[PDB]
Amino acid sequence: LALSLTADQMVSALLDAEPPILYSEYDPPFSMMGLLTNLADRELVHMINWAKRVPGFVDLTLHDQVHLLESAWLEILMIGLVWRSMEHPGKLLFAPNLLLDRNQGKEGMVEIFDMLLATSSRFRMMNLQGEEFVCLKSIILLNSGVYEEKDHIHRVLDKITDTLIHLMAKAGLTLQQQHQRLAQLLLILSHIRHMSNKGMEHLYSMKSKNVVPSYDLLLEMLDAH
Amino acid sequence: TADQMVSALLDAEPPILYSEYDPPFSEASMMGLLTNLADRELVHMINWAKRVPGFVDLTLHDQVHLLESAWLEILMIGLVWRSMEHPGKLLFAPNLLLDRNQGKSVEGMVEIFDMLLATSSRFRMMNLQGEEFVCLKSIILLNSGVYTFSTLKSLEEKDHIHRVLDKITDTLIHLMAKAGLTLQQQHQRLAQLLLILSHIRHMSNKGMEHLYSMKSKNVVPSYDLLLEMLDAHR
Ligand SMILES: C[C@H]1c2ccc(O)cc2O[C@@H](c2ccc(OCCN3CCCC3)cc2)[C@@H]1c1ccc(O)cc1
Ligand SMILES: C[C@H]1c2ccc(O)cc2O[C@@H](c2ccc(OCCN3CCCC3)cc2)[C@@H]1c1ccc(O)cc1
């Protein structure tokens, strides 16, 4: 029934659903990966609660909800990082008390640092709006793991598309500018998927205990009724 | 114009190549046939790219850069396209049509086979048109490596690529409008089509991982090779 929402209501619901910005657990004597892992793990929880507030998401089975999160969790983290890093050229704001440049990024991380920084710059160049950001983040959640259930996801995706066009029309853009900007934003998501892939490779190469959140962890965080 | 754009892309389409003929197939020679096929389609791909409007306007260095980034994606989407009318099978060639069971012979291949098969199914579900296909393939060429290029020349390059990309978007909208779609249906299908590219990028990455794991002499076409094919003389 979350499809009956209007473009205005869709945008409003997403804006309110935005997760908070977290701080790194560092006693402000400067171990970097440890800080990032701790932050990522804590930001995962809020992501799950955010996802539940994305219109149409909880209409899916818990099984399908977990699958989507399994596919999209790193992508969602990255675009979130890029977003809050927009107003800080050449630096990645992992947290308000943890803003790093590519020099600090220097084993195998600098390559991914540069990709993230380039995406942030692109956001900057395009003057990405908050209303557009929440739409793009929602698209990632629903689309990343899509390869009655599948049809519902596409209907939700279509609704977000209508909303993006609505926002751009509201911003005064012409019709040609609207479909052009829509394409530009969606093409950015392909790059974000690319970063997530390379990021996964890099994280696995670190030989940590685990990289991906388990099915049970995601399920538990969802908090079924 | 959008119409001129579509025509140029259609005419630029590379031919469908065949696997060698000898009157049986064996799972041991499978990777060999695919490698042979892939290498031969690479040559035609370079010639295709040169005929993509705006591509040859770029420096040879940046042309090579784009192909390095997109070459596997382009191979995959081409494979998915000609496999579209063949449910449950991948038409690598008219005389080389494989199922996922044959994929099991090569360690790690079924996973990538399934992703390709899923993409073919999506094309089928969406009733993807040939005009739309060539648009998507050109977009891959120009966009895939545009995010991994500070020189003043590079700034000119990226802006040019974005202008070409914008034109292809206009062409897609033109095609769908011509197809009778409403404005809302146009924006929805455009998004649907562009989101598929995210999956294709995903397959290319996983495919690259798989190819490297095979410990062959090389996986990616070298800069000098791409340059050599791209750096034609007069
Ligand atoms: C993008 C970066 C990021 C974004 C937001 C954030 O709050 C923290 C952050 O730090 C990096 C990161 C570090 C570790 C990590 O995985 C640790 C394992 N957890 C992942 C969730 C379950 C278990 C995931 C991401 C992470 C990263 C990802 C890939 C990479 O190659 C380097 C750093
Ligand atoms: C997508 C598949 C494909 C597409 C079109 C085609 O004509 C052949 C084809 O077979 C698979 C393939 C096999 C080998 C290959 O690389 C051989 C190295 N050359 C690549 C270009 C220069 C060197 C690249 C792709 C290839 C594939 C790719 C990744 C993978 O994990 C499994 C099969």
Author numbering:
A (entry chain B): 306 to 333, 336 to 337, 341 to 416, 419 to 459, 470 to 547
B (entry chain A): 311 to 333, 336 to 461, 464 to 548
Passage from the reporting paper:
Ligand binding mediates distinct changes in receptor conformation in the ligand binding domain (LBD), leading to differential recruitment of coregulatory molecules, binding to specific response elements, and post-translational modifications, such as receptor degradation. Agonist binding to the ERα LBD stabilizes helix 12 (H12) docking between H3 and H11 to expose the activating function 2 (AF-2) cleft for coregulator binding to a conserved LXXLL motif. Antagonists bind in the hormone-binding pocket and extend their side-chains outwards, preventing the agonist conformation of H12, which docks in the AF-2 cleft with its LXXML motif and blocks coactivator binding, promotes corepressor binding complexes, and affects downstream transcription. Overall, each structure depicts a canonical antagonist binding mode where H12 binds in the AF-2 cleft to block coregulator recruitment.
The ERα LBD-OP-1156 co-crystal complex was solved to 2.00 Å resolution by molecular replacement with one dimer in the asymmetric unit (ASU). The ERα LBD-OP-1074 co-crystal complex was solved to 1.55 Å resolution by molecular replacement with one dimer in ASU. Both OP-1154 and OP-1156 were well resolved in the ligand binding pocket. Each molecule participates in similar intermolecular interactions within the hormone-binding pocket by forming hydrogen bonds with its phenolic oxygen and H524, the hydroxyl of the benzyopyran ring and E353, and the nitrogen of the pyrrolidine ring with D351. OP-1154 (3S-methylpyrrolidine) and OP-1156 (unsubstituted pyrrolidine) did not show statistically significant differences (by one-way ANOVA) in their half-lives, which were closer to 4-OHT at 4.5 and 4.3 min respectively. OP-1074, OP-1154 and OP-1156 inhibited E2-stimulated transcription in a dose responsive manner with similar IC50’s, which were in the low nanomolar range.
